Structure formats: C-alpha cells, structure tokens
Design a protein around this ligand. Structure first.
Ligand SMILES: *[C@@H]1O[C@H](CO)[C@@H](O)[C@H](O)[C@H]1NC(C)=O
Ligand SMILES: *[C@@H]1O[C@H](CO)[C@@H](O)[C@H](O)[C@H]1NC(C)=O
Ligand SMILES: *[C@@H]1O[C@H](CO)[C@@H](O)[C@H](O)[C@H]1NC(C)=O
Lengths: 105, 99
C-alpha cells in the first residue's frame, strides 16, 4: 500500500486495470539527540512506557518515536524494574512525582 | 583436450546472454541493505535513515512482539551470545552440509 507509513488509499478506474492512490506518512526534518536506555533515580531503574529518552545539552526528556514532542520525565510515563547495576548505559537523572506537590499544598 | 558441451551448443546457434547486474553490484546492494538495517532499523525503508543504538533497536523489536523492554536490558549479554552462537551454527552447517 505504498512507500511510507500507510494512511489511506483511493481506487480509480482505468482501461483493463485499476489505479490506487496511496496516501502515506513520511517524516521530514530530523535532528540529532543524545539518548539513554534507562534513568537511574533513587537506586531504581526507570524505563519509558511508550517513547524514548532524549536529551538536549542540559536536560532530559521523554518523547514519542516518530515525532519530537518532549515531555517532563514523570512516574506516569515511566515504569520501574530492578536497580541500576544491570543496565548498560544507564544515566543519572531525577524523576518527577506529581503526588508530592498535591500532598504538600 | 576434448570438445566441450558449451562449444557444441554455441556452434548450433544457442547463446547464453550475461545479466545486467554483476555479482559485485548485487553484493553492493546487499551490503547497503545490511548497513541500513543495522544502523537505522526500519526507519531507512520509510524515508530518511535515522540512527539509533542497536541495543535500543532490539528493545524496540522486543516491544513489538509483546515482551517488555527491560527483559533485553537485563539479559543483553545472553541474547548477544545466543545470536553469535546461532550465526556460528549456520556457518558450520553451510561448511558441512550441501543439500
Ligand atoms: C548529526 O550528526 C552527524 C555527525 O555528527 C552529522 O553528519 C549530521 O549532519 C547531524 N545532523 C543530522 C540532522 O543528522
Ligand atoms: C534544554 O531544554 C530546556 C527546556 O526547554 C531548556 O531550559 C534548556 O536551556 C535547554 N538547554 C540547551 C543547552 O539547549
Ligand atoms: C550516579 O549516582 C550514583 C549515586 O548517586 C553514583 O554512585 C554514580 O557514580 C553516578 N553515576 C555517574 C555516571 O555519575
């Protein structure tokens, strides 16, 4: 159904045949980023639920794979598995907890 | 020495034509496909080639088949050893069996 990520298709009539108009999704403008497989926070390894850990020159974010939409790393979009002594390439960063400012205020 | 069968075929009007792509061109295409698969994953087949580390690409592949990606990151050396052993068994089978 065409080259790229397929979205729709439209048939058209032709003599002794058919013509398909394949609508696809093509990514356009990429950008280099620094990535890590996990985030080590409080002695626990954090893995993203869906998406990928990326970084600019100072901060660390989580974004989806096919579009750059960076978001704050939080316990809602990450899950915990094991400690930091197993994963190769783990980095040190903090993970936000939404319950603490709601409980404090 | 003796008359070949190919000479007897050629003397009677039968001719074999060479293909358009030589074996070096097929090897170049195969090497390009292998390098694009290893370095980029499946991104090079749907547009521009985007780089990704191979461990993270294999975590993506495990997440495709319904296994969480911490299984790879906690068992990376074992899976690498299993892949290397399987490639070695294919090499041994291709050196041994010809059927
Ligand atoms: C990313 O980095 C490579 C090498 O440092 C460079 O060739 C390339 O232009 C950069 N940008 C993109 C969008 O790939
Ligand atoms: C990284 O992104 C954060 C949030 O947008 C920003 O505050 C910071 O200045 C950025 N750092 C660099 C080096 O661009
Ligand atoms: C990450 O933090 C731990 C403890 O806070 C420390 O032992 C380790 O060296 C840090 N890693 C890096 C790369 O600084």
């Amino acid at each position: 159904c065409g080259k790229g990520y397929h979205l729709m298709s439209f048939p058209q009539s032709a003599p002794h045949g058919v013509v398909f108009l394949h609508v696809t999704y093509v990514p356009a403008q990429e950008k280099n980023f620094t990535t890590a497989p996990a985030i080590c926070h409080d002695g626990k390894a954090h893995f993203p639920r869906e998406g990928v850990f990326v970084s600019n020159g100072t901060h660390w974010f989580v974004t989806q794979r096919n579009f750059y939409e960076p978001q704050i790393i939080t316990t809602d979009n990450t899950f915990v598995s094991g400690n930091c002594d197993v994963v190769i390439g783990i980095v040190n960063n903090t993970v936000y907890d939404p319950l603490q400012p709601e409980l404090d205020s | 020495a003796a008359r070949d069968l190919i000479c007897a075929q050629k003397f009677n009007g039968l001719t074999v034509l060479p293909p358009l792509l030589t074996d070096e061109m097929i090897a170049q295409y195969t090497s390009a496909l292998l390098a694009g698969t290893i370095t980029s994953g499946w991104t090079f087949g749907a547009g521009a080639a985007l780089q990704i580390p191979f461990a993270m690409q294999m975590a993506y592949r495990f997440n495709g088949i319904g296994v969480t990606q911490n299984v790879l990151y906690e068992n990376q050396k074992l899976i690498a050893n299993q892949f290397n052993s399987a490639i070695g068994k294919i090499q041994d089978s291709l050196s041994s069996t010809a059927s």
